[PDB]
A paper describes a structure:
One prominent IFN-γ inducible event is the upregulation of two subfamilies of IFN-inducible GTPases, immunity-related GTPases (IRGs), and guanylate-binding proteins (GBPs). They specifically target the PV membrane (PVM) and disrupt the PV in which *T. gondii* is enfolded. Upon infection with *Toxoplasma gondii*, host cells produce immune-related GTPases (IRGs) to kill the parasite. *T. gondii* counters this response by releasing ROP18 kinase, which inactivates IRG GTPases and inhibits their recruitment to the *T. gondii* parasitophorous vacuole (PV). The parasite-derived ROP18 phosphorylates host IRGs including [name] at two conserved threonine residues in the switch I region, biochemically abrogating the GTPase activity of IRGs and inhibiting the recruitment of IRGs, thus rendering IRGs inactive.
To assess the effect of phosphorylation of the Thr95 on [name], the amino acid was substituted to aspartate as a phosphomimetic mutation (T95D mutation), following a previous paper. Consequently, [name]-WT hydrolyzed two-thirds of GTP to GDP, whereas [name]-T95D hydrolyzed only about 10% of GTP to GDP ([Fig fig2]). This indicates that the phospho-mimicking mutation of Thr95 (T95D) in the switch I region of [name] significantly reduced the GTPase activity of [name]. The crystal structures of [name]-T95D were solved with GTP ([name]-T95D-GTP) and without nucleotide (nucleotide free: NF) ([name]-T95D-NF) at 1.68 and 2.05 Å resolution, respectively ([Fig fig3] and [Fig fig3] and [Table tbl1]). The former structure possessed GTP in the nucleotide binding pocket ([Fig fig4]). [name]-T95D-GTP adopted the same conformation as [name]-WT-GTP ([Fig fig3] and [Fig fig3]), with an overall root mean square deviation (RMSD) from [name]-WT-GTP of 0.259 Å ([Fig fig3]). As in the [name]-WT-GTP structure, [name]-T95D-GTP represents a collision complex with GTP in which the switch I and II regions are located away from the γ-phosphate of GTP ([Fig fig4]). Phosphates in GTP are buried in P-loop.
Residue numbers in the entry: -1 to 88, 96 to 208, 211 to 401, 404 to 415
């Protein structure tokens, strides 16, 4: 009933990292209020409007800094674009669209130094209101011009982040200079402290030390997390989708964002009192074909993406796929029927956010099929990060999706 529905909605969202939740805690409170008050149409109306906002949300990122700071490489790295390809970044602001997400654009802004504007006049010239946040980039030490731009951005109620690039080169130079006494943490601390302490003379700012050529190292993961934390809840979905599938943390940000979105879609469609039947499963899988291929694209599991990984393993994409779970997820194994496996899965998924006493809330079969595919795709993408080492020891290289096996 309504109280079971509200509690299982609450239980579902409690399982996610704060920076990953695609609805706000007020959104949750209002949906729970309406459900508990039997205002079901109002609750569905909130969910519909939340989903429309999530699906239409644009993401506009301004990247500013002087020349030689790695700005073009950073803009390309953000988008997953090779330095060679069409749309790669090599006066006036220049847009760089995301290659795979229409609503996402990274803007190359000329450094305020190379102009003669005040901070406030710089912001108005570059059209400050179009952006969700600003990245201020340097490969050295940030000039007072940048502390003043940040102060101007902040006084306008927007977010900025100082990003110090080329940290890998400075570490490499120090290790070669002082191989007996090299202390990576001391170098990083000395660089961060200098930037932080000098920027503060005009502001303590978040400073992130990064290598533009490896988004998995140094402070780049902490930067992605902070950017997620600071965005409005509804924009975290498009931001998560824009990330590279290059770390476990980023794959899981995508996995968690998509799982929340399909749960909200399930809510909008309506709770069910009984487990959905399986007589039509092949037909539901067929209706979901386009969606499953979209999910494969999000996680880098489409056939074209698998080409790169299969060659580096010196094997065919086909032999590679043998050891991934998503290709035969829905195919019978061990002479167990798919609908009997799905029935056990649904009882597991529903007792997690439901417990053993309250009435159990079920959703349409398509919800469980999408949820299962997302966990499988994400687990396959994670295994891809470490496929060489996994291949040597362990028939699938990936972990099974939660609750599917028994
Ligand atoms: N090791 C390392 N190389 C980098 C990094 N950032 C950029 N590069 C390299 O530096 C070269 C380009 O240098 P820059 O001209 O200073 O930066 P850019 O990417 O061209 O962008 P601009 O700021 O407009 O000059 C390319 O070879 C990049 O591969 C970094 O963080 N680490």
């Amino acid at each position: 009933g309504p109280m079971a529905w509200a509690s299982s909605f609450d239980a579902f969202f409690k399982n996610f990292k704060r920076e990953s939740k695609i609805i706000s805690e007020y959104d949750i409170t209002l949906i729970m209020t309406y459900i508990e008050e039997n205002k079901l149409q109002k609750a569905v109306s909130v969910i519909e409007k939340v989903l429309r906002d999530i699906e239409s949300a644009p993401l506009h990122i301004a990247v500013t800094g002087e020349t030689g700071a790695g700005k073009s490489t950073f803009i390309n790295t953000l988008r997953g674009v090779g330095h060679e390809e069409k749309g790669a970044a090599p006066m006036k602001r220049t847009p760089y669209p995301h290659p795979k997400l229409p609503n996402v654009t990274i803007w190359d802004l000329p450094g305020i130094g190379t102009t003669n504007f005040t901070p406030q006049n710089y912001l108005t010239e570059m059209k400050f209101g179009e952006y969700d946040f600003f990245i201020i980039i340097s490969a050295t030490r940030f000039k007072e011009n940048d502390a003043q731009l940040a102060k101007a951005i902040a006084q306008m109620g927007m977010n900025f982040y100082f990003v110090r690039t080329k940290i890998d080169s400075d570490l490499d130079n120090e290790q070669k200079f002082k191989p007996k006494s090299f202390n990576k943490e001391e170098v990083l601390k000395n660089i961060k402290d200098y930037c932080s302490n000098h920027l503060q003379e005009s502001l303590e700012p978040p400073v992130f030390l990064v290598s533009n050529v490896d988004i998995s190292k140094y402070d780049f993961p902490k930067l992605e997390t902070k950017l997620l934390q600071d965005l409005p809840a509804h924009k975290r979905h498009v931001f998560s989708l824009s990330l590279q599938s290059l770390t476990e943390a980023t794959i899981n940000y995508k996995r968690d964002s998509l799982k929340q979105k399909v749960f909200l879609e399930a809510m909008k469609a309506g709770a069910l009192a009984t487990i959905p039947l399986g007589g039509m499963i092949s037909d539901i899988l067929e209706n979901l074909d386009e969606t499953f291929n979209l999910y494969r694209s999000y996680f880098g599991l489409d056939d074209a993406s698998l080409e790169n990984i299969a060659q580096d393993l010196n094997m065919s994409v086909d032999d590679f796929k043998v050891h991934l779970r998503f290709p035969h997820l829905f195919a019978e194994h061990n002479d167990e029927s798919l609908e009997d496996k799905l029935f056990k899965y649904i009882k597991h998924i529903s007792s997690v956010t439901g417990g053993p006493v309250a009435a159990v809330t079920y959703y349409r079969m398509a919800y469980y099929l999408q949820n299962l595919f997302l966990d499988t795709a994400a687990n396959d993408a994670i295994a891809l990060l470490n496929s060489k080492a996994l291949f040597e020891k362990k028939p699938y290289i990936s972990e099974p999706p939660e609750y599917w096996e028994a």
